[PDB]
Amino acid sequence: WVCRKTYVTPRRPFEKSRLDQELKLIGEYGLRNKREVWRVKFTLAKIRKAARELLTLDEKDPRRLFEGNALLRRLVRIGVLDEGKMKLDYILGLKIEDFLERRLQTQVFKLGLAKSIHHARVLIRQRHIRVRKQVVNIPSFIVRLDSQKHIDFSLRSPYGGGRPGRVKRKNAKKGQGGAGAG
Amino acid sequence: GKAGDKEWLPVTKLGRLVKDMKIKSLEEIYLFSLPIKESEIIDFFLGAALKDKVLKIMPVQKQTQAGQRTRFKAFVAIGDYNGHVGLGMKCSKEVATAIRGAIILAKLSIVPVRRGYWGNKIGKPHTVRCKVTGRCGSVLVRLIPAPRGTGIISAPVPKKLLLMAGIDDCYTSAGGCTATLGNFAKATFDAISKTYSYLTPDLWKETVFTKSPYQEFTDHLVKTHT
Amino acid sequence: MQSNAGEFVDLYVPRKCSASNRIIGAKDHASIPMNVAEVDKVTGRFNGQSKTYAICGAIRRMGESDDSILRLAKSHGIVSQN
Amino acid sequence: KVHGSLARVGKVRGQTLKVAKQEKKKKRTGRAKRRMQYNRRFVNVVPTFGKKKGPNANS
Amino acid sequence: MGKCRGLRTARKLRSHRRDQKWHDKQYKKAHLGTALKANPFGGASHAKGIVLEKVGVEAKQPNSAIRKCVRVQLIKNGKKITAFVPNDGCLNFIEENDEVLVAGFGRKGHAVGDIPGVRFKVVKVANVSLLALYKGKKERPR
RNA sequence: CAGACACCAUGGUGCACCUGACUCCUGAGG
RNA sequence: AAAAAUAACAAUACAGGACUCUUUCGAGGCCCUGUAAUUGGAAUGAGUCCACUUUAAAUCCUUUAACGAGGAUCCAUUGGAGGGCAAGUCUGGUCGCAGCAGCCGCGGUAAUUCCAGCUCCAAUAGCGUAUAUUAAAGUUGCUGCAGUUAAAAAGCUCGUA
User: Fold this and answer.
1) Going from the N-terminus, what domains does chain B have, and what CATH number goes with each?
2) C-beta neighbour count of E4 within 10 angstroms
3) Alpha-carbon separation of residue B84 from A161, B87, B171 (angstroms)
4) Residue B21 burial (CB < 10 Å; 0-12/13-18/19+)?
5) Å between E2 CA and G161 C1'?
6) Shortest CB distance from D6 goes to which of E60, E88, E91?
7) Which residues from 27-86 of E have any strand G atom under 7 Å from their CB?
8) Which positions does the record annotate as the modified residue N6-succinyllysine (chain D)?
9) Residue A118's closest CA among B67, E116, D39?
10) Which of the listed residues A35, A125, A146, B78 has the most CB atoms within 10 Å of its CB?
C-alpha cells in the first residue's frame, strides 16, 4: 500500500560532539541505538513545524483553533505536556528527553520490578508485565496518563503469580536434577 | 606546580573607578562608549565563566634575507554565555605565545551583543530581534532569528560564536569564499555586534544623555593627578 | 529595548542624538557628549547644572558637529548675545 | 604510460602471514555494547584522572 | 545583475534562462547524450564484458609504480575500455576470456589518479567478486 | 644641461613542520 | 518499510566519588561500572511441540501442557582510523616495490596512509560499492548573480518589432 520511515538521518555523518550527546541519551534512557534517538528527532521536528504553522495562521480561524486544540490534547494525554501551559509557544520549548521520560521502560524503572534502565527494557521484552490485563512487549511505547496506574506483573511470568512455564520449573529442577543428581 | 597572580596599574581614570567600585559593570562603560585599555577591568567584573576557544593556530610567513622565516598566527575568541563576546588575533614566534597574547587581546575587545526574540516577548530572549549581516573580504554571513527548539543551524566556526553570543536559535546563510576561516569568524563577529547598531521602534524612546563619569568623579579621581 | 507590556530584556539603554537622530552604539569611538556649564545669570558665577548634548561618530567624521552644537544650544537656550 | 609487462604481484603478501588471538570474551552484541560504551567512558570511575587523551592514543 | 523585469516580461525571462543553461559543461554533456555515446556509463550503472588482454602499465609520473590494468570489451555497450584492477596482488586471478564486471570509478566520465585513459575499475573477476577473493571468503572457481 | 654611449646563447632536484600546568625541591630546624 | 533480540540482576576480588571517622595517611560507607573467579536463584523465545485457533482446504501469526542460557556461549556484521573524517606521536613486515589514492597526497628504510596482526572508532541486521537524479550551489542567480583589471558590454549611431 504505502509505507514511511519513522526516523531521520542528518546531513553530517560525523560530528563527534553530537555523537557523544546521542550516546549519553542512549545511556540515560536505556535505548538500543542512535536509530531510537533519530525516531524521536523525526517526531519532535514535525510537532515543532506543526506548531509553527498554526502560530503564523490568523487568530480565530477554524483550522488554527481545531488543530491547535487537537495537538495540545494529544500531548497532554501522553503526559509529555501539561495543560497549565497549553499553547503553541510552549510546545516549541520541548526537547527529546521529555518524550523518552514518558515511555513504558522509564515507568517500569520508576515503579515496579526493574533495578535499572537496563533491566526494565529486558523485563518488558520478556513479557513480565501487563499494562492492564494486556501484555506489552514493546519498550518504546509511550504510555498515557491513566495507563501508568495499571503497570503490574503478568500472569505469564510465574513469579508475581501465574501458570508455571518452563523457567520456574527449570529452577525447581536445579533442586531436583542439579541437587537431585538426576 | 604553577599558580597565577594579578596586579592593577592604572594610567587612566577608568581603571581607578573600577577598582574603587564606582563602576560595577562593563555595561556602564559600553553605554558611555568609552574605551577599555585594561584587561583587569573585564577580569574584575567577570573573570569567571569566560571560555576561551582557539579557532585556529595556523602559521603564516614572510621570507627573510637568508632562507625562510615562519611564525604562528592565532585566533582566539572569548565570551560568557550572557551576551558578551570578544575576538582577538595575535601573531607571535611560537604557538603558545601567540595564543597567550590572543587571549589578552580578546578580553580587551569585549563588546555587548543585543539579544532579542523571533516573535516572542515572554520567557526571555533566545535569539536576536533583527537580522544582521557582516562582510569580511567578500564573505558575507547573514544571521536570521529562528524560533525556539530550532537550534543553531550554522557551520561549526560561526556556531561557536553564536553560542557564546546567547543566540541559541539561528538560521544562517554564508556566501563567498568557504576556504577561509579567519574571514568567516570575523564576518560573523561584525554581524553579531550590529544588533545594537540597528534602531528598532522599541529602542526609539530617547534619553537625556550622560554627564560623563570623568566630570562627575573629577574630585574623587584626584589621587595625585586628575 | 522593551519586551511585552514593559518587561526589560536588555543589557542597557544606549544614548541617542538629536543632531541627526541616530543612536550611539555599542562601544564606538569618537562618541562623547559635551557638558556646557550653566551660569545662573544676572549676578554671574557658574551654578550647576549641565546642559549636555550627545555627539556621535557619524556627525564628527562628516564634519557637521560645529554648527550642530549651536543649533542645539540656541533652540533650548541660553547664551548671551542671543 | 602504455607499456605491456606485468612484473611483480603480491610481493608484500608473499612474506606477511596472519595469526589470531582468539577470545577471552566475545565482541559484544547490539544494545549491551552500546550501553557498555557509555558506562565505560563515563560512569566507572567518574572521570577526574588525566586529560587530552584518546581511546587508542599513545599521546 | 542585469535582466528585464517589467509587467509582461515573463516570456523573455523564461526563454533567456533556457538559452543560457546550455553553456555549462556538466549540463551540456548529459543533455546532448554525449555521456552515453562516448562513455559506457551514464545510461548504465554496471556492465559485464569479456577480458581481451591483461595489460601492465608503467604509470605516468608523479608516483612510480606499475599500475596494472585489464582491457575489457563490454558486451552491452560494445566499447573497448581499460579498467584498473584494485586490491593487492589481485591482478593474478584475471585470465583472458574469463569475464569481469566493470563499474565506473568516482570522477565520472574523466580519468582518475596519475594514469590517463583509465576511469573505470574492476569489481568482480569471474563474476563472483574480486573483494571476496582478496579477503578469502570465497575461492576462485575458474 | 652643451664631447664620444658595440656582440653575448644555453643549463637540474627532496626533508622549511604544529599543545598549557613556576621545585636545585628545601631534606639542622622545618 | 515496521518492531528491536543475541542477555538481565546480585555476590565477591579490585579502580573510583558525595557521606562519616581520623590532623592527614588510612579505614568504614551506599550507588554500583567495568575485569577475574565462578555462581546463585530468576527470566525468555531462536529452536522443539500434544492441544485450541487460522483458512476454500491449508500455511504462518497471534494461544499454550512438556522442553530450551553461567559461557572462548543459543558465539553479528560492514567500512574507516595521515588530511577533509569520527578513530593508532600503533607492533611486525615491506621500502616509490607490492599496493594505497573520489580529491589532497602517502610508500625512494627508523611508513601514525601500504601489507598483515593488535587496538580503537562509526553505523548496528544491517553496512559497503557503482550509477542516475536532488540537496548543498546566490556554480544558471524569478525571489537572488557576475561583466575596470579574475570567464564576460556589440566599432559607432539611427531604428521597427
Assistant:
1) 13-112 (3.30.160.20), 115-203 (3.30.230.10)
2) 11
3) 63, 11, 20
4) exposed
5) 22
6) E91
7) 27, 30, 35, 41-42, 44-46, 62-68, 84, 86
8) 51
9) D39
10) B78
Task: Give E37's Cβ-side CA count (13 Å radius).
Answer: 6
- Chain centroid to Cα E22, Å, comes to 24
Residues of C within 8 A of B206 (CB-CB) are: 16, 18
Beta bridge partners of E102: E47, E122
Q: Does D18 touch chain E (CB under 8 A)?
A: no
CA separation for the pair E75, B168 (Å, rounded): 59
Residues 1-59 of D with CB under 7 A from strand G: 7-13, 15-27, 29-37, 39-40, 43-46, 48, 54-59
Q: Which residue of B has its CA nearest to A16?
A: B156
- What domain range is C62 assigned to? 1-82
Q: Which segments of chain A does DSSP mark as H helices, in order?
A: 16-29, 34-56, 62-77, 88-91, 97-100, 104-110, 119-125, 168-172
Kindly state the cell numbers that stand for D22.
582468539
Please say whether the beta carbons of B188 and B158 come within 8 A.
yes
List chain G nucleotides near protein: any atom < 7 Å from a Cβ: 1-10, 15-17, 32-36, 40-45, 63-69, 72-73, 75-77, 79, 81, 85-90, 92-94, 96-103, 105-108, 114-125, 129-133, 137-147, 153
Q: What are phi and psi of D15, to 5 degrees?
A: -150, 15
C-alpha cell at position E107 = 570522477
User: How was this one solved?
Assistant: cryo-EM
Residue with cell 593487492: E88
Domain ranges for chain E, please list them: 1-142
Burial of B98 (0-12, 13-18, 19+ CB in 10 A): buried
Q: Report the CATH number at residue C65.
A: 3.30.1230.20
Task: Give the resolution to one decimal, in Å.
Answer: 5.8
Establish if A21 touches chain D: CB-CB under 8 angstroms.
no
